[PDB]
């Protein structure tokens, strides 16, 4: 049955990508037991994590381009098998360049997880339900990030880092063998009905780059607020460290509920409409949430003092988390959905490369502006870029969203 | 008397820059008598005019940078003496490379006219009256453009192109000798009271480049509408050639009244305010007029048919001309006004180089988008860029407008 296959393939892909995001950050999760066992440096740890970041940028791009050509089930379970072999070799490693090289290989293999998920969600799930199941699979990412450090500290208190990370890699190998048999990349695999364009017809479509610059701005504003809202509450808003950490936790909880709400309400907006090729019924709430980022960063910049209570801090953290992790889910939804069927993952990779560009823009120039001028000037520049792109995307909401050839 | 010097120096500079803009386009003005006398090609004529355009781009930049170092009266009357010597040599010329080289030298010498006007208006006129006298000197430019072809056709019907252009150059020589003695570049020349920063302190100020990108967008949208609104009414709006030409004349008359209204009402807004260094009281109506460009191009794009009358065409032409030539005057006003006193012309030149960039963007990529997609898609991309920069400049209205050092 078609719904039985939707349930089974998405549950296997749910557990699979939870294992993916758990083993994208396992060295981050079991970091205290490893630095108790063997000594490292701060710059050495940063080199390992930056090697993963560079390899995972390259691998998101290469895996998005390759997921259109080769199948999704083999690319998915081969990525999880490579992650498992990497963690098996990593737990039995002792010297620092072997740590850095194997974690570079894990950065290469973590990219092979999500564009197969994008191809499966593209060919299986209807556009009237694509956003909410996309949001539940990003909730699998968030569930891995939640249950990661807790049970990681449990298994690092019970067993060592070698045993925990080796059993995690062996679990990736087992879930790879048991998720190769439980992903079908199209409904035409089991005999069900499915639901021509080239790459230059995707790249010359303006909606890919409007979507990419909107995702660039939204991810850069998300990343600068996520990385420096703690210091913005410490230094220019007079709040303590507990209020800044609880503001980050409010932004994360609001981000989970905002990703799920963006998916579900954008699928409600897609079911009620969808007769024309120009425009997108997901823009009608993507713009609500980008205006929510505007109103949220304004009411967090000018209406936060040292005397305004923690309730307003938590409310504004939840509303900016809502209004920010919603659009990142929606730019992923549209980069997979408004693309041609054989140019879906390429479109999502070209959009997701702007995550790397915006992460660099929120790391070095945002901290540069916050060091030279002030923190409020830097976060206000972020609010200006986000609100100007909110207005620009409200203008550009009615370009030809369905990409590829024009006929 | 201080007001007597304001009147006399501005009247001499008024007649001077009228002679400047009349002799910037005299070969364009007396073009029919010259093509009756000697034969040319369309690409030859285009090479002459493009040589002037390139030399005048280079000369606006070099003259703006040089007007801060050397005096304004000598640079001004030396520019007018060079224009006069060029036209004296040009009227007595016969061969095509001499035409192109002398008109290149006129392109080099027309740049030497306006940054001395900017320095004189900067040091003489108060910021509570700077915009309206700036607008009257741009009205001198428009008066030269109005009385140019009319009396040019009169003097080309009476005398030849040689006699007319030679008497025009001799009038530039006479007005140069009689305007060197009637421009004082500071009130400290005659003993009146006047009204430290470096170049890297100007270039690293963000308001110069926010102002430059706003002027880039406004001049590109002005230039694409001015160059292609005729064809947009011919081809996609069903209007005849007379309605398109009268729409352009309505945009020009509206542009003159909008430049003067921007200057006068921005000086009224400057007199009523002006206590802080952040923000600019001219932004409060520069944003009204950029929103006027937005509303004007929207109500000209979607509420113009083949059945909507010529009254709505003329009203929308006047309102977009208002709302477009207002801001170009105001970006000049602010590029001269919000700059340091010894970095005024450099700031105006760095802003005015974006006129060259936006003129190229409205020439080749705008016609490229209008050839590939449609005319309404191209003008809608122009409306999107103008409205997105309207919103971005409404955000950025409160950056530190006073440029230079921070103390």
PDB file of N, CA, C and O in Angstrom, chain B residues 319-349:
ATOM      1  N   UNK B 319       4.507  61.547 -11.838  1.00  0.00           N
ATOM      2  CA  UNK B 319       4.765  61.087 -10.479  1.00  0.00           C
ATOM      3  C   UNK B 319       6.034  60.243 -10.422  1.00  0.00           C
ATOM      4  O   UNK B 319       6.825  60.383  -9.481  1.00  0.00           O
ATOM      5  N   UNK B 320       6.314  59.422 -11.444  1.00  0.00           N
ATOM      6  CA  UNK B 320       7.593  58.715 -11.431  1.00  0.00           C
ATOM      7  C   UNK B 320       8.764  59.646 -11.725  1.00  0.00           C
ATOM      8  O   UNK B 320       9.858  59.434 -11.196  1.00  0.00           O
ATOM      9  N   UNK B 321       8.559  60.690 -12.530  1.00  0.00           N
ATOM     10  CA  UNK B 321       9.626  61.648 -12.760  1.00  0.00           C
ATOM     11  C   UNK B 321       9.961  62.438 -11.514  1.00  0.00           C
ATOM     12  O   UNK B 321      11.138  62.600 -11.179  1.00  0.00           O
ATOM     13  N   UNK B 322       8.928  62.935 -10.821  1.00  0.00           N
ATOM     14  CA  UNK B 322       8.997  63.464  -9.461  1.00  0.00           C
ATOM     15  C   UNK B 322       9.826  62.575  -8.555  1.00  0.00           C
ATOM     16  O   UNK B 322      10.943  62.926  -8.142  1.00  0.00           O
ATOM     17  N   UNK B 323       9.327  61.361  -8.364  1.00  0.00           N
ATOM     18  CA  UNK B 323       9.863  60.434  -7.398  1.00  0.00           C
ATOM     19  C   UNK B 323      11.199  59.847  -7.803  1.00  0.00           C
ATOM     20  O   UNK B 323      11.820  59.201  -6.966  1.00  0.00           O
ATOM     21  N   UNK B 324      11.652  60.041  -9.043  1.00  0.00           N
ATOM     22  CA  UNK B 324      12.942  59.524  -9.485  1.00  0.00           C
ATOM     23  C   UNK B 324      14.020  60.589  -9.616  1.00  0.00           C
ATOM     24  O   UNK B 324      15.132  60.380  -9.131  1.00  0.00           O
ATOM     25  N   UNK B 325      13.745  61.726 -10.265  1.00  0.00           N
ATOM     26  CA  UNK B 325      14.785  62.747 -10.325  1.00  0.00           C
ATOM     27  C   UNK B 325      14.925  63.496  -9.010  1.00  0.00           C
ATOM     28  O   UNK B 325      15.919  64.211  -8.836  1.00  0.00           O
ATOM     29  N   UNK B 326      13.952  63.387  -8.099  1.00  0.00           N
ATOM     30  CA  UNK B 326      14.148  63.860  -6.751  1.00  0.00           C
ATOM     31  C   UNK B 326      15.306  63.191  -6.027  1.00  0.00           C
ATOM     32  O   UNK B 326      16.233  63.860  -5.569  1.00  0.00           O
ATOM     33  N   UNK B 327      15.256  61.860  -5.892  1.00  0.00           N
ATOM     34  CA  UNK B 327      16.354  61.126  -5.251  1.00  0.00           C
ATOM     35  C   UNK B 327      17.718  61.251  -5.883  1.00  0.00           C
ATOM     36  O   UNK B 327      18.693  61.150  -5.145  1.00  0.00           O
ATOM     37  N   UNK B 328      17.846  61.442  -7.193  1.00  0.00           N
ATOM     38  CA  UNK B 328      19.185  61.594  -7.754  1.00  0.00           C
ATOM     39  C   UNK B 328      19.788  62.923  -7.318  1.00  0.00           C
ATOM     40  O   UNK B 328      20.964  62.992  -6.918  1.00  0.00           O
ATOM     41  N   UNK B 329      18.962  63.973  -7.307  1.00  0.00           N
ATOM     42  CA  UNK B 329      19.350  65.239  -6.702  1.00  0.00           C
ATOM     43  C   UNK B 329      19.677  65.071  -5.227  1.00  0.00           C
ATOM     44  O   UNK B 329      20.667  65.620  -4.750  1.00  0.00           O
ATOM     45  N   UNK B 330      18.898  64.262  -4.502  1.00  0.00           N
ATOM     46  CA  UNK B 330      19.147  64.109  -3.072  1.00  0.00           C
ATOM     47  C   UNK B 330      20.375  63.257  -2.775  1.00  0.00           C
ATOM     48  O   UNK B 330      21.060  63.518  -1.789  1.00  0.00           O
ATOM     49  N   UNK B 331      20.682  62.250  -3.597  1.00  0.00           N
ATOM     50  CA  UNK B 331      21.924  61.510  -3.397  1.00  0.00           C
ATOM     51  C   UNK B 331      23.136  62.367  -3.716  1.00  0.00           C
ATOM     52  O   UNK B 331      24.164  62.239  -3.047  1.00  0.00           O
ATOM     53  N   UNK B 332      23.025  63.272  -4.691  1.00  0.00           N
ATOM     54  CA  UNK B 332      24.069  64.271  -4.863  1.00  0.00           C
ATOM     55  C   UNK B 332      24.183  65.222  -3.680  1.00  0.00           C
ATOM     56  O   UNK B 332      25.296  65.554  -3.248  1.00  0.00           O
ATOM     57  N   UNK B 333      23.034  65.672  -3.148  1.00  0.00           N
ATOM     58  CA  UNK B 333      22.994  66.582  -1.998  1.00  0.00           C
ATOM     59  C   UNK B 333      23.664  65.945  -0.793  1.00  0.00           C
ATOM     60  O   UNK B 333      24.475  66.568  -0.103  1.00  0.00           O
ATOM     61  N   UNK B 334      23.370  64.676  -0.554  1.00  0.00           N
ATOM     62  CA  UNK B 334      23.910  64.020   0.621  1.00  0.00           C
ATOM     63  C   UNK B 334      25.363  63.607   0.401  1.00  0.00           C
ATOM     64  O   UNK B 334      26.174  63.666   1.334  1.00  0.00           O
ATOM     65  N   UNK B 335      25.744  63.248  -0.830  1.00  0.00           N
ATOM     66  CA  UNK B 335      27.137  62.912  -1.100  1.00  0.00           C
ATOM     67  C   UNK B 335      28.043  64.125  -0.998  1.00  0.00           C
ATOM     68  O   UNK B 335      29.237  63.982  -0.721  1.00  0.00           O
ATOM     69  N   UNK B 336      27.504  65.318  -1.206  1.00  0.00           N
ATOM     70  CA  UNK B 336      28.307  66.503  -0.947  1.00  0.00           C
ATOM     71  C   UNK B 336      28.168  66.998   0.490  1.00  0.00           C
ATOM     72  O   UNK B 336      29.107  67.585   1.034  1.00  0.00           O
ATOM     73  N   UNK B 337      27.021  66.766   1.121  1.00  0.00           N
ATOM     74  CA  UNK B 337      26.685  67.388   2.397  1.00  0.00           C
ATOM     75  C   UNK B 337      27.115  66.548   3.594  1.00  0.00           C
ATOM     76  O   UNK B 337      27.659  67.085   4.566  1.00  0.00           O
ATOM     77  N   UNK B 338      26.887  65.238   3.551  1.00  0.00           N
ATOM     78  CA  UNK B 338      27.208  64.355   4.662  1.00  0.00           C
ATOM     79  C   UNK B 338      28.660  63.908   4.666  1.00  0.00           C
ATOM     80  O   UNK B 338      29.012  63.006   5.431  1.00  0.00           O
ATOM     81  N   UNK B 339      29.494  64.516   3.851  1.00  0.00           N
ATOM     82  CA  UNK B 339      30.911  64.261   3.688  1.00  0.00           C
ATOM     83  C   UNK B 339      31.726  65.246   4.512  1.00  0.00           C
ATOM     84  O   UNK B 339      31.216  66.289   4.930  1.00  0.00           O
ATOM     85  N   UNK B 340      32.991  64.936   4.796  1.00  0.00           N
ATOM     86  CA  UNK B 340      33.885  65.933   5.397  1.00  0.00           C
ATOM     87  C   UNK B 340      34.130  67.095   4.452  1.00  0.00           C
ATOM     88  O   UNK B 340      33.962  66.951   3.232  1.00  0.00           O
ATOM     89  N   UNK B 341      34.516  68.264   4.980  1.00  0.00           N
ATOM     90  CA  UNK B 341      34.708  69.436   4.109  1.00  0.00           C
ATOM     91  C   UNK B 341      35.841  69.297   3.107  1.00  0.00           C
ATOM     92  O   UNK B 341      35.754  69.878   2.020  1.00  0.00           O
ATOM     93  N   UNK B 342      36.896  68.550   3.426  1.00  0.00           N
ATOM     94  CA  UNK B 342      37.968  68.291   2.475  1.00  0.00           C
ATOM     95  C   UNK B 342      37.851  66.933   1.801  1.00  0.00           C
ATOM     96  O   UNK B 342      38.755  66.546   1.058  1.00  0.00           O
ATOM     97  N   UNK B 343      36.778  66.193   2.059  1.00  0.00           N
ATOM     98  CA  UNK B 343      36.482  64.953   1.354  1.00  0.00           C
ATOM     99  C   UNK B 343      35.097  65.010   0.724  1.00  0.00           C
ATOM    100  O   UNK B 343      34.435  63.986   0.565  1.00  0.00           O
ATOM    101  N   UNK B 344      34.644  66.210   0.371  1.00  0.00           N
ATOM    102  CA  UNK B 344      33.304  66.364  -0.177  1.00  0.00           C
ATOM    103  C   UNK B 344      33.238  65.877  -1.616  1.00  0.00           C
ATOM    104  O   UNK B 344      32.416  65.015  -1.955  1.00  0.00           O
ATOM    105  N   UNK B 345      34.112  66.414  -2.471  1.00  0.00           N
ATOM    106  CA  UNK B 345      34.098  66.051  -3.876  1.00  0.00           C
ATOM    107  C   UNK B 345      34.526  64.624  -4.133  1.00  0.00           C
ATOM    108  O   UNK B 345      34.060  64.004  -5.089  1.00  0.00           O
ATOM    109  N   UNK B 346      35.416  64.086  -3.292  1.00  0.00           N
ATOM    110  CA  UNK B 346      35.774  62.674  -3.394  1.00  0.00           C
ATOM    111  C   UNK B 346      34.573  61.791  -3.093  1.00  0.00           C
ATOM    112  O   UNK B 346      34.332  60.803  -3.795  1.00  0.00           O
ATOM    113  N   UNK B 347      33.788  62.163  -2.079  1.00  0.00           N
ATOM    114  CA  UNK B 347      32.577  61.422  -1.746  1.00  0.00           C
ATOM    115  C   UNK B 347      31.554  61.504  -2.867  1.00  0.00           C
ATOM    116  O   UNK B 347      30.935  60.493  -3.227  1.00  0.00           O
ATOM    117  N   UNK B 348      31.398  62.692  -3.456  1.00  0.00           N
ATOM    118  CA  UNK B 348      30.464  62.841  -4.564  1.00  0.00           C
ATOM    119  C   UNK B 348      30.934  62.096  -5.809  1.00  0.00           C
ATOM    120  O   UNK B 348      30.104  61.585  -6.560  1.00  0.00           O
ATOM    121  N   UNK B 349      32.247  61.980  -6.019  1.00  0.00           N
ATOM    122  CA  UNK B 349      32.751  61.235  -7.170  1.00  0.00           C
ATOM    123  C   UNK B 349      32.580  59.734  -6.985  1.00  0.00           C
ATOM    124  O   UNK B 349      32.251  59.019  -7.940  1.00  0.00           O
TER     125      UNK B 349
END
